[PDB]
Each structure stands twice: as structure tokens, then as C-alpha cells.
């Protein structure tokens, strides 16, 4: 049952339109009413139990002797039920649990007020249950209850409430641990006082199987990973909108100077050996004029098409010390150019279009471990590339980013000869998680399957932080994580998660293609598939890496990505054979350890 109670506005049974109904209120049994669901009843009732676990203490504390009892506040009523009038109109119900907001609140506040009172007792009681082993993974262990109490008495914190209400603590423990039993002085009787036998049955191992709760949970955790990865998205063969494909990105590091321009498509460079060299002047947003030189070798970042991006430059550790130039006290800055002329063609100050020094810092140098070298202090020169702020209009406009030495005095070309200060650590951070790029430039949509096996190690390393590959890799790794939670296959052993590839391979070698055909027996295809899966789990980026043995083929990827869903969903509270034995074998060793400890306890706190 669920929703709200509706009563015939005025006419008994002759109710026909949604208008003939009205929110049944308290004045019909002046707050409005609400249907208390089957679920809500079951759970809030279980909440009450939370208090009853410490009934003996609560009373000895003279507080909340009136245990809440939810079913008591409920009022069963015959009425039309629904969230809306229309739905309610065709749904009459007999004996609907109902309650007013105020009473629901008053109830919960009683449970909470109670828990607040148990606040410390709750902690002190847990402290007693973990000071020494109160449980064991498998089997059973024992210790002279008197030795146990001796120990507690010798170690519990002075302010423990247990020291003030020993007998109440006894009940409290016995109420939740079937293994802790207090003999009735009256009838010399002793027995399990725990109220959680059913629950514990799901947390214990059988002679040859791990706990059902564990097998269930773990398998559930594998499926949540697969769902979060989104099989349909990462195995899609058609375009997927960038916003939909993307996920929270991570930063990336580069040394713009050591990148290869035929690999990092977002860099431009003035060719050396041309004697190109020209001094220019640019102002910062406060009108201050700056001097710097552009020459053969100078590199810049082609801002256009990289999407929102934050740049942070760290010249820490570098030298830049020359015969007639000391970086100490000098200044470096980020300059953003706006010109119609391609950067590679620059040779005169007249071609730089519109330029602005967007940020700068003063450097501090000292002596490094390397003799004769100066070491520059760490910097954090930042620049946020916000496409909307630049507002590119003219399609022939190029947007460039440079990092060089800037000075209030013209920089003598023969003193400071470096082309720029890009030989530093650059950290890029996307300023958006709704745009994706592929090898340097923005794309409005991605085709996940075509990413498979299309990146060389060089290309991946040079891609921007918001590259589709990088994203594909982070989504894929959730699949790898999932497969590993369920798969305990050793080297070359088949499994429900490796065979999907084997299937593709089996058919693939039969398909008519080109080149020398080969035939592998099922047994060998089975291994190749196993190794492919292992390589994937150990390095998820292999799927987007060129020529990667088997994962380089989009078909094997799709088969695996999609297969996993079936592999997990068709399980029945099961656990790997290899795993099942290992778990029990391990649980036993821990049980044994537990006993050996309890013995030491008995030995150092002897029973009378």
C-alpha cells in the first residue's frame, strides 16, 4: 500500500470523477493523512529493536520505559488510495495503515532521542566486544568466561559504563552474541540469549562454502561496477554525445619542450636554422609593458579546439643559467596571442596580431646539486583557457599560448638565448567535464568502438586530459575491476569472462579475409583468450593501444564488455572453486589463531 488516503467529498459510493474526492484528514478519525507503507512498517519496527538490545540498561537509566511500538500509532482505515485523485479513484482499499506527519515525526523523535541516550553505552559496549576476539570466521573457540571478565576489568577504560552496570552489560552482550551466556544463579541453567540467530546464519560458512551474505554482496559489487561502466556506452558502435560519454577527468603532465610536434597536434613551433629572431612588446591587463623575444625554436600551445583548460607551469628544478643570464630575480609569463597568421610563419613583430601577458611570476634561483648550475624555485604560473571569454569570431583567427622570460627592460638576444621556458613541468586540468577531445581536438560525439586499438603509446601520452581514450580507459577499468572480483582464474585457465573473446576468435579465423589463414584448436584459442583478459585486467589501456594482441580488435572488446553482464547475472549465490577452498582454509587458520590468543588470555588471567 502507498500514497495518501482519499475520502468521498460528500457522496457515499456515488463517487465518479477525481473531483468527487478529497484528502482524508485527521478530522475523519486537523492534519492531512499519509499511507504508511508495508516497507516503512517493517523497517521502523526493526529500528525499535535497536533500543530493545539495551532495554536492561535503558531502564536502569530511568529513561524511555515506554518502548515506541510503531504499529501502535498506526490507524487502519477503509478508503481510496493513491498519490493522485485519479489513481486513488479506481483503487479502494480496506484497512490501510495511515498516520499524520506530526505523529510520524513524534515517533521517530522518540527513537532518535533514545539512541542519543544510548550514545556512549553503544560505544563502551562495542569496545568490550573488540578488546578481545568476540567472534570467529569459522568453527568455534572458547575461553574461561572468568578469564575474559578478568581481562576486561584489567583493560577497559575507567569511564566505561560497563564498570558501572556489569550485569546490564552482560545481558546486552548475551542479547547479541549467542556465544556469550550467563548462567542463571537461580536454576544453574545456561543458554543462548541472542536474538539474532537468523541473521548470523547468513554470515557463517558451511563445511565447504563461504557465507551466503559474502557471496551475495561481492557479486552485487561486481554488477554495480559493470552498471557504472555502462556496457551500452563503452561498446557502442554508433556516435555517443560527448557529454554522455565523458566522466570526471584527471590532470596530466607534460614537458612541452620534450613533446614531439608530430605527436602532440596541439603544439606549433618556429623552425630553427632560419636565423629567425625578433623582439616584441606586449602589455598585461594593467597596462604594464613587457619585453620578450621570439626566435627559432619557440613553441606555443594552439589553444583553439582544446576545450576549457587550466594550465599550470612549474619551472622548479630547471636551470636556464647562461653566461650572461641569471634566472634569479627574472620573470616569466604566459602570453596569449590572437593572429590570423600561422605561428610557424612568424619572423617579424608585425605578424603577432593581438597579444596580452595574462599572468607572470618572479623566479627565485639557488644552487643545485649539479655544480655550476642554478636551480629555480617551484612555480605555479597559471592560466585558464575559457573559449567563451576569447570569443573566436573570425575563422582565420589562431589562438596561441607562450611561456617565456618577460622583462621591463628589452631582453638582449645574445644574453638570454632560450626560445621559451617550456622546458618545465606543465600540468593541464580540464575546466569542463562535458567536452571530449580525440588526439588534440574537440569532437561533439564519440564512437567508443573505433577508439579500440587506434592509439600508439606516443599518441596516448600526448593526448589532452580530456581525450576520449583516457575516458574510455577509466570506464573500462570498472569492467576489469568487476571481472576480477568474480574471476580467480590462474594463468591460461578459461573462465566465464574469457570465453567471450574465444568465441570471437573462433569465428574470426574462419572468416574469409586476406593473408595467410591459420587454424587454432579450441584449446589454444581458449588460452589466447585467457591471456587477453588478464592483460586487460592488468592494464586496461591495452584496449585502446595499437596492435595490442587481442584487445586491439573491436569485436573482442564488444564481446567481453557485453559478455560480463551475462556472466554475472546468471550466477546463483556462487563463488569460485579455487576461492571457496581458500576462504575456508584461511577462516580456519584465523579461528585457530583466535583460540591460541584466548589461551594466552586464560593463562594470564587464570580462572579461580
Amino acid at each position: 500500500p502507498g500514497g495518501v488516503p482519499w475520502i468521498a467529498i460528500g457522496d457515499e459510493t456515488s463517487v465518479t470523477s477525481p473531483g468527487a474526492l478529497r484528502r482524508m484528514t485527521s478530522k475523519d478519525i486537523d492534519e492531512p493523512l499519509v499511507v504508511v507503507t508495508e516497507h516503512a512498517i517493517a523497517n521502523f519496527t526493526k529500528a525499535e529493536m535497536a533500543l530493545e538490545f539495551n532495554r536492561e540498561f535503558l531502564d536502569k537509566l530511568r529513561v524511555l520505559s515506554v518502548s515506541p511500538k510503531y504499529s501502535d500509532l498506526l490507524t487502519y482505515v477503509d478508503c481510496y488510495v493513491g498519490v493522485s485523485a485519479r489513481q486513488a479513484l479506481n483503487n479502494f482499499q480496506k484497512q490501510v495503515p495511515v498516520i499524520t506527519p506530526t505523529r510520524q515525526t513524534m515517533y521517530v523523535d522518540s527513537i532518535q532521542a533514545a539512541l542519543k541516550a544510548l550514545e556512549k553505552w553503544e560505544i563502551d559496549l562495542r569496545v568490550a566486544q573488540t578488546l578481545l576476539p568476540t567472534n570467529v570466521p569459522i568453527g568455534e573457540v572458547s575461553c574461561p568466561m572468568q578469564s575474559v571478565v578478568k581481562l576486561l576489568d584489567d583493560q577497559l577504560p575507567d569511564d566505561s559504563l560497563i564498570r558501572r552496570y556489569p550485569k546490564e552489560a552482560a545481558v546486552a552482550l548475551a542479547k547479541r552474541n549467542g556465544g556469550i551466556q550467563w548462567m542463571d544463579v537461580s536454576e544453574g541453567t545456561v543458554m543462548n540469549e541472542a536474538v539474532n540467530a537468523v541473521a548470523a546464519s547468513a554470515l557463517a560458512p558451511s563445511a565447504s562454502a563461504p557465507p551466503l551474505e559474502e557471496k551475495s554482496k561481492l557479486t552485487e559489487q561486481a554488477m554495480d561496477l559493470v552498471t557504472a561502466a555502462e556496457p551500452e556506452i563503452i561498446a557502442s558502435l554508433v556516435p555517443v554525445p560527448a557529454p554522455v560519454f565523458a566522466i570526471p577527468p584527471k590532470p596530466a603532465d607534460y614537458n612541452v619542450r620534450t613533446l614531439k610536434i608530430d605527436e602532440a597536434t596541439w603544439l606549433r613551433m618556429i623552425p630553427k636554422t632560419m636565423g629567425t629572431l625578433f623582439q616584441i612588446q606586449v602589455t598585461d591587463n594593467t597596462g604594464t609593458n613587457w619585453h620578450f623575444n621570439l626566435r627559432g625554436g619557440t613553441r606555443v600551445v594552439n589553444l583553439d579546439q582544446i576545450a576549457p583548460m587550466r594550465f599550470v607551469l612549474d619551472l622548479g628544478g630547471k636551470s636556464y643559467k647562461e653566461t650572461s643570464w641569471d634566472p634569479n630575480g627574472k620573470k616569466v609569463g604566459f602570453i596569449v596571442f590572437q593572429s590570423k597568421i600561422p605561428f610557424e610563419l612568424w619572423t617579424a613583430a608585425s605578424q603577432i596580431g593581438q597579444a596580452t601577458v595574462v599572468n607572470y611570476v618572479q623566479l627565485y634561483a639557488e644552487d643545485s646539486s649539479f655544480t655550476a648550475q642554478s636551480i629555480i624555485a617551484t612555480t605555479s604560473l597559471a592560466y585558464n583557457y575559457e573559449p567563451e571569454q576569447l570569443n573566436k569570431t573570425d575563422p582565420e583567427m589562431n589562438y596561441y599560448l607562450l611561456a617565456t622570460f618577460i622583462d621591463s627592460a628589452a631582453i638582449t638576444p645574445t644574453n638570454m638565448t632560450q626560445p621559451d621556458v617550456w622546458d618545465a613541468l606543465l600540468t593541464m586540468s580540464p575546466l569542463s567535464a562535458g567536452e571530449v577531445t580525440v588526439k588534440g581536438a574537440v569532437v561533439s560525439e564519440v564512437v567508443p568502438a573505433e577508439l579500440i586499438g587506434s592509439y600508439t603509446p606516443e599518441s596516448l601520452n600526448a593526448s589532452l586530459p580530456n581525450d576520449a581514450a583516457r575516458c574510455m580507459i577509466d570506464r573500462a577499468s570498472k569492467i576489469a575491476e568487476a571481472i576480477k572480483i568474480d574471476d580467480d582464474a590462474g594463468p591460461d585457465e578459461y573462465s566465464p569472462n574469457s570465453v567471450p573473446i574465444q568465441g570471437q576468435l573462433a569465428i574470426s579465423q574462419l572468416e574469409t579475409g586476406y593473408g595467410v589463414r591459420i587454424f587454432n584448436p579450441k584449446g589454444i584459442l581458449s588460452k589466447i583468450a585467457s591471456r587477453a583478459m588478464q592483460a586487460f585486467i592488468g592494464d586496461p589501456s591495452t584496449i585502446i593501444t595499437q596492435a595490442a594482441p587481442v584487445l586491439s580488435d573491436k569485436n573482442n572488446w564488444i564481446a567481453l564488455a557485453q559478455g560480463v553482464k551475462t556472466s554475472l547475472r546468471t550466477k546463483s549465490l556462487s563463488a569460485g572453486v579455487k576461492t571457496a577452498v581458500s576462504k575456508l582454509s584461511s577462516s580456519e587458520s584465523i579461528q585457530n589463531w583466535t583460540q591460541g590468543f584466548l589461551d594466552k588470555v586464560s593463562t594470564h588471567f587464570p580462572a579461580p
Partner: protein
């Protein structure tokens, strides 16, 4: 009516009697309605 210091008391932790109280319940909005 028990003696925390007496005999006849039992301390036998076992897998079958794993202690538990009320760690968490199902209280999501959509479920409680």
C-alpha cells in the same frame, strides 16, 4: 540474577553465533514512499 564473576558462565564465540545488532536498514526515500 547472574554472576559476572561466577562459574557456569559461557564464552564460546562461534561462526554460527556471529554477533550483530542493527548496523543498517532499508531507508531510501523511494522505498519508504
Amino acid at each position: 540474577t547472574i554472576n559476572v564473576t561466577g562459574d557456569g558462565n559461557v564464552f564460546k564465540p562461534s561462526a554460527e553465533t556471529s554477533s550483530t545488532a542493527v548496523p543498517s536498514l532499508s531507508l531510501s526515500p523511494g522505498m519508504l514512499n
